[PDB]
Amino acid sequence: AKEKARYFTFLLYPESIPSDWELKLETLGVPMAISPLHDKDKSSIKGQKYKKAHYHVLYIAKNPVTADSVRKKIKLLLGEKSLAMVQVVLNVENMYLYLTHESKDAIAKKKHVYDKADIKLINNFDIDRYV
Amino acid sequence: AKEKARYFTFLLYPESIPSDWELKLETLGVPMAISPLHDKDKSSIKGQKYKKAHYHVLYIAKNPVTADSVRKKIKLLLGEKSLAMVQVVLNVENMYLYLTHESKDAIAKKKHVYDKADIKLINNFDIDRYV
DNA sequence: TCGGCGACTTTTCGGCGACTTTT
DNA sequence: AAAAGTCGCCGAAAAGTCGCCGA
Ligand SMILES: [Mn+2]
Ligand SMILES: [Mn+2]
């Protein structure tokens, strides 16, 4: 009895993805919203500069499918270590604001807040359609 | 069978806790109330002026959980030796005023009275809701 | 007596190949 | 045949109680 759902978020690392990863993700025909790059997140480790550059993708599947469905589809796309920690997204509004660290979880924990503009929306991601 | 309860008090020693302990207690997401620093308690031994610096944390679990649980929950958070003497609290109010030694028993036994201003409330600890 | 800790138990949840349904 | 999708099944950690205490 795995959970089937429409909204997912996962991480992409610049190392494990090919050059054209952006055009690579457009192919699937599914609305995505790709956070700006996270080169400046404070690590929960002493003396430690920042966490590694990563992305937060917000993935809007067209029908209820399972976490594993999405992991594998992007594992085919970009390399089997391309992504990590695919999760089911419960509140879309938050996990969109979370790409900027400008949700309330993030500013409450005072994390470094990125630029609205660098978010990349693939196949006409409509924030309003899902809220 | 051990006792289940929602209200707890335990002690925090500044030596055994990391710099960012205060913020790390906020992570647990639980209403806490942290005594002002207890650096001038009268020691019960002759020629011993003060007791070792401590804090009294006042801890409100979201569901009746066991003394031991809270102990694990905090060892893992601040270090195996971070805390001490976790007990269940039967009257919050009295034990709230005890953080300043302004309860009945504290003023009764002539304990050193600290300043409210230094009390720290974590996650919107609202003493009034508890009476 | 009653706070304590290691041993244990129990959820919790994200992986990943293997099997299965869909195209 | 191939794509996509889910199904067992594993592991680890974050949680929790239990056993015995021990001063
Ligand atoms: Mn991040
Ligand atoms: Mn004290």
Author numbering:
A (entry chain B), B (entry chain A): 2 to 132
Reproduce passages from the article:
RepB, the replication initiation protein of pMV158, is a member of the HUH endonuclease superfamily, which includes proteins involved in the replication of plasmids, bacteriophages and viruses, as well as proteins with roles in DNA transposition and in conjugative mobilisation of plasmids. Each monomer of RepB comprises two domains connected by a short hinge region. The C-terminal or oligomerisation domain (OD) is a helical domain responsible for the hexameric state of the protein, while the N-terminal or origin binding domain (OBD) carries the catalytic active site and is in charge of recognising, cleaving and joining dso DNA.
In this complex, the asymmetric unit consisted of two molecules of the DNA oriented in opposite directions, and two molecules of OBD bound to each DNA molecule. The DNA molecules are in B conformation, with an estimated curvature of the DNA of ∼25°. The two OBDs are positioned on the same side of the DNA molecule because they are all bound to the GC-rich region within the 11-bp tandem direct repeats, which are separated by a complete double helix turn. The binding to the GC-rich region in the absence of DNA bending causes the lack of protein-protein interactions between the OBDs bound on the same DNA molecule, in agreement with our results indicating that there was no cooperative binding of the OBD to the DNA (see above). The binding of the OBD to the DDR drives this latter loop to move 3.16 Å away so that Met86 locates at approximately 3.0 Å of G8 of the top strand in the OBD–DDR structure. This movement includes the 180° flip of the Ala85-Met86 peptide bond and results in the extension of strand β4 by four residues in the N-term direction. The interaction of the OBD with the DNA of the bind locus occurs through the major groove and involves residues situated in the N-terminal part of the domain, namely the N-terminal tail, the α2 helix, and the neighbouring loops connecting to β3, α2 and β4, and the extended strand β4 or anchoring strand. More extensive are the contacts of the α2 helix, which fully penetrates the major groove, adjacent to where the N-terminal tail is situated. Regarding the structure of the OBD bound to DNA, it is noteworthy that in the OBD–DDR complex, the active site is not found in the vicinity of the DNA.
